[PDB]
Design a protein around this ligand. Sequence first.
Ligand SMILES: Nc1ncnc2c1ncn2[C@@H]1O[C@H](COP(=O)(O)OP(=O)(O)OC[C@H]2O[C@@H]([n+]3cccc(C(=O)O)c3)[C@H](O)[C@@H]2O)[C@@H](O)[C@H]1O
Ligand SMILES: Nc1ncnc2c1ncn2[C@@H]1O[C@H](COP(=O)(O)O)[C@@H](O)[C@H]1O
Lengths: 649, 339, 340
Amino acid sequence: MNFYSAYQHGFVRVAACTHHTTIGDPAANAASVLDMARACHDDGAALAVFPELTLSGYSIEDVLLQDSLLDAVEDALLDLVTESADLLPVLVVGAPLRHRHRIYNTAVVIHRGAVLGVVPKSYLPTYREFYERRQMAPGDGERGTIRIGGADVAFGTDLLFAASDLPGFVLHVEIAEDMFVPMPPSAEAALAGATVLANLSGSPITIGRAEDRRLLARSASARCLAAYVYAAAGEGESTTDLAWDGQTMIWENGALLAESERFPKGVRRSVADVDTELLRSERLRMGTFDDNRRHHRELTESFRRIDFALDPPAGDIGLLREVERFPFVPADPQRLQQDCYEAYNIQVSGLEQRLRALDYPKVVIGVSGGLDSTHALIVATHAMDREGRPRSDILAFALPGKNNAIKLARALGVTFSEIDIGDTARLMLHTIGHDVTFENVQAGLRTDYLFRIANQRGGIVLGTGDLSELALGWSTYGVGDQMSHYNVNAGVPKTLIQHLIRWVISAGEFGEKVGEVLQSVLDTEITEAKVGPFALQDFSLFQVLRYGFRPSKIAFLAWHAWNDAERGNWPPGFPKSERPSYSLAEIRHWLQIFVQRFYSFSQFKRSALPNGPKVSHGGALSPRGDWRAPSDMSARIWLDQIDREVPKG
Amino acid sequence: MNFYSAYQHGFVRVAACTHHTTIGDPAANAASVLDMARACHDDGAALAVFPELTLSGYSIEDVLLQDSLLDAVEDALLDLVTESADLLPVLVVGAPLRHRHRIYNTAVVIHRGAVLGVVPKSYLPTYREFYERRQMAPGDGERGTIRIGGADVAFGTDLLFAASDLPGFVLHVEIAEDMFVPMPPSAEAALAGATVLANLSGSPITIGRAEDRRLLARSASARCLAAYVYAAAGEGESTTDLAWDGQTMIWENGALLAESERFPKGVRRSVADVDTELLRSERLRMGTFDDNRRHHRELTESFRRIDFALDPPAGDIGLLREVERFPFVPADPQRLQQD
Amino acid sequence: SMNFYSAYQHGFVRVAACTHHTTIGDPAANAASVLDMARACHDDGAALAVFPELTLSGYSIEDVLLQDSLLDAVEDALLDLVTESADLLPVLVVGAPLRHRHRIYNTAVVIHRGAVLGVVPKSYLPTYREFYERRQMAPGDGERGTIRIGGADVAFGTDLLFAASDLPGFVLHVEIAEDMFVPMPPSAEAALAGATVLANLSGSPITIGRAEDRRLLARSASARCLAAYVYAAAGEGESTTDLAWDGQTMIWENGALLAESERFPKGVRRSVADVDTELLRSERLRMGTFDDNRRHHRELTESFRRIDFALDPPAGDIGLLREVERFPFVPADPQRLQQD
Ligand SMILES: Nc1ncnc2c1ncn2[C@@H]1O[C@H](COP(=O)(O)OP(=O)(O)OC[C@H]2O[C@@H]([n+]3cccc(C(=O)O)c3)[C@H](O)[C@@H]2O)[C@@H](O)[C@H]1O
Ligand SMILES: Nc1ncnc2c1ncn2[C@@H]1O[C@H](COP(=O)(O)O)[C@@H](O)[C@H]1O
């Protein structure tokens, strides 16, 4: 396999194009279409979607009904078809075409010298600035075939274009207004199998219309678990009564992959790599999507599937896609602030319920001065404040076997104390006739003490292990830090914890002293890679937990995100000395370790897990929630996948 | 005519309510529901929507299948119904109810001492943190009636509640996940006539989920030329594995009318005046909306219409709505800069 | 003319229910255990080998079913089996989580002589008590059409019958686990439509009393449907994170037990018996109300698709794997004879 090929990793390269309109002149429009299609070809694109009525111009009104115009459209369309014999991408071009009694506003799907199909718009707006029913017939409910340059090709609203060599790429095409009705053609097509939804739009621009386009194309892509590819008309449409902004965009399951300049001068393309496996993975898991199809089975079974062989380029053509380094930590500051606010309120409100339900016990917690336990102590305080409970009901414990610990505790005003576990550990090690056991005897005694104090003092022990530690099994099982009465960090990955502390500092409601101590914790602690860098492990974890991607796909994505520290954006709080870049060899190394630990070694530790709230849309690792898996399984197949598919460096 | 009455100008006052959950304790949830409904009444609201499985709590898992729990839900539901005899608004309350072989995740629509109908959730998520098909049966495709405290009332995914004195107020009710599938019950109901779409949600909060809720309730309300009234569960749900933010919101044709504080302490309501005439005017003009109905005629004609008489307050009750001085000039600077 | 000592020439069909060694999360290993047992079934001249539910992945792996590498490994392993089957006599019925359309299905792949004859999805997916199947997998009830497996379109759905063109008494229908437990099981419509041999691939974690439940339903099925019922459960290797497994296999014929293997074995086990297709044929010939029931459910029963294959069984003496009592009227079992 070619590890550097995006097509081999389930990517399909898609283009939404806005061309130069010459109204009433089809050979000129076709010439602009052919030039852009040659570009999309050179880019290795599999699909190029153009605007509504591309070949005539959308805005020409009664001129659509003129024989010379209709004639010119056909001649021009047939030239394109002939040119397409040497073009890689499927071309979706607009054209007013005669069929039966009337003209239809259609999209012609073209590929390698043939017309695969012809799709008519279903809903024809005839209100406000729109007059479509005057010239054109509604396509909804039309089936059968249409004759185009001596051939009978599929015609109708029921068409799917499936790539026979790219099973994840199934195209449905709709037109403009089609996407705006309560029950759009594209939603039935997704149910029926379409993974990529194209929209050819005219869409005269008005104040606020761009926002409407986005709301509907975006919600469509999220509801239908699909890529949505959208192209509007720009320069060259008539301005007798309307203006045009040439907007193009590409959405994937709710996220913007690419958009182009509004009101540009000259032609514009959006070009993105759509991840078909991502779409595949979400449909695999969201069972109610398939339930919805089954409930509309007669609607969804009637589609006709037109097959074509794409034969994409096999080599390295890069990756036109933003792969963030931190799936759990958005590089956008407004976004990361939102996530922090939510993470923190999740942790707190979760603990508050546990406390209310237990009639407000004391809170017992081991504070080591580390990131985790610090953040947990902050969470616990805010919870007790919100519930109108004295901060002295928090029992924080230093359990040496740092100063930041006692300082924070003193600053917050919780009840602080120290218990030296060393003698108890000595006694235990001697009694046992005594490395893992030595480490573990201490970690165990910590938990054992806290538990007994909780019994003694009417409290509950607060766990502090984080999501990355759960994932990797980096904890001490049962009698050890893995165990507690309620774990507030169980759902937060290590990569996020530091930003939550930053957020608490920046908000500043604990006051300046607490602020300074927390800041000190930060400065001290960012200065256990037998399990590798947490940045890479949190990366793999997201891919595995959310999408179940194979290891070679995970390596490809990580390498694209991490291999060059100059490219892509870093979240806030990463000074340049801490902007590592990783080689393929390194990614490959830590990934072998990740699959071994994640799929084989660690599950038993997750299997007997204390209560705590899920936090990230990435998922959590509760065996009662997002991750059900055997405690007694080998990881051989994952390890073998890496062996065979990921290059050594 | 009373010129100062919102109801006489085609407004309908609507409330999305997040109550205090006491898991496993129906009479306590009912008491929280009754208190908020009495508030919604005092405000002259016509509609009060509560969160998914209001009466039992959404988060209780196999406890849903315990007879004493199911029994307590019924008793509590029937007490509410009796109390509603003196309440103005239509109450939409969640309840696990037994019907035929199983329990359904349902919304009970209650009005002035009667149950107008019972709507079961259609799509039951059984993935990630959701386990709903384990305890509860899918309601998609169910019609007929259900027996509730000695009476046969309409049961199913095909119901429309039409105010006989307020023609612009036609209610459809769906539940949580129903709004997230490619072809939601509420989209067919809008084509068939519903102007106000209610959603009872549980919706454990996760990073980014609040944005997903908004994207889907908003696009719904825009595509369906309707008001969309949404209530999520908050304080009191179990935190064994999840947390809850109590979010409530009301959308009208793509615009936010009202939302309440996330993660509140105590109960919260969004209350807005919905402009039924604005909805009516947009449907009047967008022909392709009606074309879409005609194309799905067998789907859209099969709805059952349950009529009720609202009898709203006739006097001045103010106007719970932001009316901008300059329809053409947004007061929000980021907005105006865009325009 | 004929070979009087050949069981095949007297209307017998040799059938095998196999419980293989599960290696959870490891399709190539399960496939190797499957191939070894199938080679044995071949040597025994068997016409049919039924394996346990989700054979190729392991039944108990939960959300691991949703992992691309696992789904990918299953496909590869399945296609290898198919290639090996070119030299195997028996039709192989193997379990596999397969992707189709939006989801994965819990399916049985029917394989014969180098081709996939058909792919059958479980219809009813238990999601209660210790079972969580709807979370990972889609219900197969009401699915028809085809599925693409290693470059070919093969029949897919709950409406399939596999008919031996040279052994008219041998018509196979396949269902899965829970399918046999609902008031109106796939296999009862399939019997009405023609099926003489009903296969069941089972996972079936063992609980106190469950083996008695399995028997009561497989046995009453075989009696009500006038058919052979061939049943295989999962054994050693399934995860014991929450469940245990007994590996039970059994073969029933019109209400009678022809063979069962050792519960909780160490190592792989097979039930192998000679099914008497003429006996089944003779009972159906005479019980008119069986055919009246089919006529009353004609639209249900006429819709099955019939996939034909040529078995070409061994012609020689291969013994007779069947208890033939000396005294049809006098049971050898004392408790039974006392009753009589
Ligand atoms: N599948 C399975 N089912 C049931 N039991 C299984 C098992 N696999 C191992 N075991 C047993 O479980 C035990 C091994 O697990 P465990 O006892 O947890 O210990 P183990 O994972 O071997 O070691 C703990 C490691 O975690 C590190 N650690 C400890 C504490 C805190 C942190 C931190 O960074 O916060 C890190 C520490 O450096 C050490 O390397 C053994 O008794 C083993 O026999
Ligand atoms: N030296 C220490 N003093 C107080 N608590 C500690 C100490 N070491 C570990 N702990 C507690 O045990 C947790 C995990 O232990 P570990 O990661 O093994 O050092 C910490 O987050 C604290 O809650």
